[PDB]
Design a protein around this ligand. Sequence first.
Ligand SMILES: [Cl-]
Lengths: 89, 96
Amino acid sequence: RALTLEALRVMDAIDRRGSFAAAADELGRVPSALSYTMQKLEEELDVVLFDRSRTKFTNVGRMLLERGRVLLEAADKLTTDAEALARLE
Amino acid sequence: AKERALTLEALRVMDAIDRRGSFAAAADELGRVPSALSYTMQKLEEELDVVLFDRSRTKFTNVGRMLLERGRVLLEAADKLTTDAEALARLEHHHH
Ligand SMILES: [Cl-]
């Protein structure tokens, strides 16, 4: 869909690094790749997620940012757990 | 927060293969050609260095099954977050 783990990762990196350009540096992509992801999410959910000026998240943007970090942690834990089992097989 | 091989879409492919019983029927459900589902599965195997399906009917490996089952928990939480975000947007009378 447009809510992807990558979109949540983009949102997390923009919050942490402060801007599209700094977040794109972290993720190793060109900035337009990050804005494209965010445009598709904003258009699907039909809401503004943040305003750049550092970056300020909207109320809906902050809920996706904060609850999305819980999902990212769970995805990393699942990845870790599956690889650990795989080494035993 | 940066293990990027696993996607929710790959988990949804996994769920459809389990529910429908074959790559062919799952691909039919998802509106894709069956080899597109094979590619998504095999690219994840290669990125994670795991094997998801038994190589001796379509059967998940023990590793594939842990991703399938615990991945459904992730899918439910992603749907819940989508619903909650949409509900907040409505109470705020979001712009279209
Ligand atoms: Cl947070």
